[PDB]
Ligand binder design. Structure first.
Ligand SMILES: Cc1ncc(COP(=O)(O)O)c(CN[C@@H](Cc2ccc(O)cc2)C(=O)O)c1O
Ligand SMILES: Cc1ncc(COP(=O)(O)O)c(CN[C@@H](Cc2ccc(O)cc2)C(=O)O)c1O
Lengths: 396, 396
């Protein structure tokens, strides 16, 4: 049976890892995958989480199957964190949430729900975009089409080119928006541009699906949900695929949520029921550990207090490593003017290096960036800066 | 968008939980979902588990993304428990293993891999079978045909209707077997009956797909893997969906595995890149806790030793709950002769009860079995024995 099977091509991102993990060179830097690092070059486990885990250790009496929808309380929490204190979405009981294996699994769940229970045939995804967006959607049968976004020549959001693109989307189409910290550009639309698309997309008849894997690294919690919050006000229906792998450091435990919002509760209920079935034929029920951490924390004032500060801390060191990055570039002999890098939010930076640059940075200096020229600021440290900035400077 | 969505009818097993949960009558018993219970009727967390968790607590420095295929250890270990320490398979590097969100997720990973890369068209699954095999396979767009298996009248494995109903299996079809502990019958083919099927399947050109989710509750670890190991000798190609949910009480952390057998290293290799690819479009990478807890315990002679006993002890108490069940049954009324029960393996028993019988125990006595009339031995205790045996008796 498998004599004919053909070797697939590796994950452009995740596959880099393997590569990295294999060079035996000394000074190898890894600006690949989006991992938050600390000053001392490591991927710590936050403190609020070890505290959460200890609590679990001494408190857990069973490993009982969770519901298909996970821990209720983790849901309440995701919602509040998503919509706000006493939103009508919550007051109206218009949202139903499901704990899933990461934000990558909230996607896959969404798209099996859409295709099986809807008339959705197409999903529009920005250009550029997170390479897995397509494969996820494709796998559920859906067609993926791309809209314009990124003004190369000037490092922004080309609004009108964006708008003009989406004028080709039929009603009933699904439009895919990154909540904040666009991956991999780092550019995000103002509150007005969100208010815009918000009105538009309502008139145009689109289904908006928000990929929110970074609440907290742009400006902060409550303010990084604005776009999303503008949308909710308008729409009767929407879907959000959220991740807690970056803001809780829980990468390998897989914590995320799939939120569904309908016109009302009777609906949402009916609709949610089908979502479950989508799960039940996938993985059945979600993993406990990681999500129980999340609720525990979000539920406790002290622990929360602690986590929030851990967050703002992660964010601030990033904002720091970015200023530091250009400065040194500048101070190191860099052709281009990189200051547009200080206009990008989140863990990355859409560098501007060509495929052959990124290819050379690696074979020749041991540096590791995604071929799009995506660079992970969070992987930058005062101890690697110089050497880093020197290789780049040599390849430019 | 969601205005015409048809509510779905709930999972037949998990759905039962909901009902149990919301029921308020004091003496309610729950013989539904396959969860191991203790003398006092709790679903305790194994000592070897707690122990390994502690270890992780103290020693975990990171939550870094696992690989697509998970913890190498975890795999290396799974194949061993699957094929046996010395096995050629291992020595021939013909197996590849991916850590997954349970036995469910492995099933699904199997389906999405087949579907997408094989030209497999139909999957054959017993009658009766576990109700999710269908849903899983369908959702991958596969045809589910049934083979015959259980001989009601004398409660047994009719090898005859078995062999005859599979005569229509086609070459390239996929035959699906429960390695041991048949859910929901509890009847298994003998090493001989196994030796034979292995012979056919070869001769008739089938892809066997083993569903192993209870290794250790029949006879014991190595004993229960006979059928599988017989197959492994003959076959060149094989698929195995394993789960640790029951033998390690890890129900809610989703731990199981998917093993791919091929003729050679190169093959399995190519063929596994494809599998990974299928993983990347679903959930990305596996959840770490639970699996880490398994490699921990299986790589440590000591905790291992502690493990193998908690298991042995779970089995023993089950077998005791069996012989006590019939004993109290007879000794309490019973027209029927339930003596065939003692001949079933694992947590359940195909009771021989009526749809309308289980509807009444539930409604009138708080008892909770599945509709097929499948009862959990494991959810039986010395304290509840009487009261259950009374209602069952009053509905005969
Ligand atoms: C925008 C975006 N959305 C979702 C995800 C996946 O999040 P999880 O919660 O499932 O981890 C990511 C992840 N992006 C990171 C990490 C990653 C993970 C898997 C694969 O295949 C590739 C990358 C990244 O490297 O950009 C998003 O970025
Ligand atoms: C026969 C069978 N095969 C596989 C599995 C996989 O369970 P995992 O928890 O490892 O994924 C099971 C488990 N079935 C139990 C519990 C259950 C699980 C999911 C759903 O939807 C319903 C019940 C059972 O009671 O049969 C098998 O049983």
């Amino acid at each position: 049976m498998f004599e004919n099977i053909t070797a697939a091509p590796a994950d452009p991102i995740l596959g880099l890892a393997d590569l990295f993990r294999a060079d035996e060179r000394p000074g190898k830097i890894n600006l690949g995958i989006g991992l938050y690092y600390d000053e001392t070059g490591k991927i710590p486990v936050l403190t609020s989480v070890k505290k959460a885990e200890q609590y679990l250790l001494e408190n857990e009496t069973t490993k009982l199957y969770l519901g298909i929808d996970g821990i209720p309380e983790f849901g309440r929490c995701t919602q509040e964190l998503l919509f706000g204190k006493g939103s009508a979405l919550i007051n109206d009981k218009r949202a139903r949430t499901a704990q899933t294996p990461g934000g990558s699994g909230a996607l896959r769940v969404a798209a099996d729900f859409l295709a099986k229970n809807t008339s959705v045939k197409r999903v529009w995804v920005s250009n550029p975009s997170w390479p897995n967006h397509k494969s996820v959607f494709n796998s559920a049968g859906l067609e993926v089409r791309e809209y314009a976004y990124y003004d190369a020549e000037n490092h922004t959001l080309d609004f009108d080119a964006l708008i003009n693109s989406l004028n080709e989307a039929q009603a009933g189409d699904v439009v895919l928006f990154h909540g904040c910290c666009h991956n991999p550009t780092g550019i995000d639309p103002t509150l007005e541009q969100w208010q815009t698309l918000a009105q538009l997309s309502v008139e145009k008849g689109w289904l908006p699906l928000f990929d929110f894997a970074y609440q907290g690294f742009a400006r902060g919690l409550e303010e990084d949900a604005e776009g999303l919050r503008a949308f909710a006000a308008m729409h009767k229906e929407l879907i959000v695929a959220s991740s807690y792998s970056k803001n809780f450091g829980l990468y390998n435990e897989r914590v995320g949520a799939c939120t569904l919002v309908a016109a009302d509760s009777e609906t949402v209920d009916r609709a949610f029921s089908q979502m479950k079935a989508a799960i039940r034929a996938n993985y059945s029920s979600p993993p406990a550990h990681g999500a129980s951490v999340v609720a525990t924390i979000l539920s406790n004032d002290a622990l929360r207090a602690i986590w929030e500060q851990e967050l703002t801390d992660m964010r601030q060191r990033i904002q720091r490593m970015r200023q530091l990055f250009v400065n040194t570039l500048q101070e190191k002999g860099a052709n281009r003017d990189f200051s547009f890098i200080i206009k990008q939010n989140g863990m990355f930076s859409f560098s501007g290096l060509t495929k052959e640059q990124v290819l050379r940075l690696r074979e020749e200096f041991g540096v590791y960036a995604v071929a799009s020229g995506r660079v992970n600021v969070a992987g930058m440290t005062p101890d690697n800066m110089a050497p880093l900035c020197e290789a780049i400077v040599a390849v430019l």
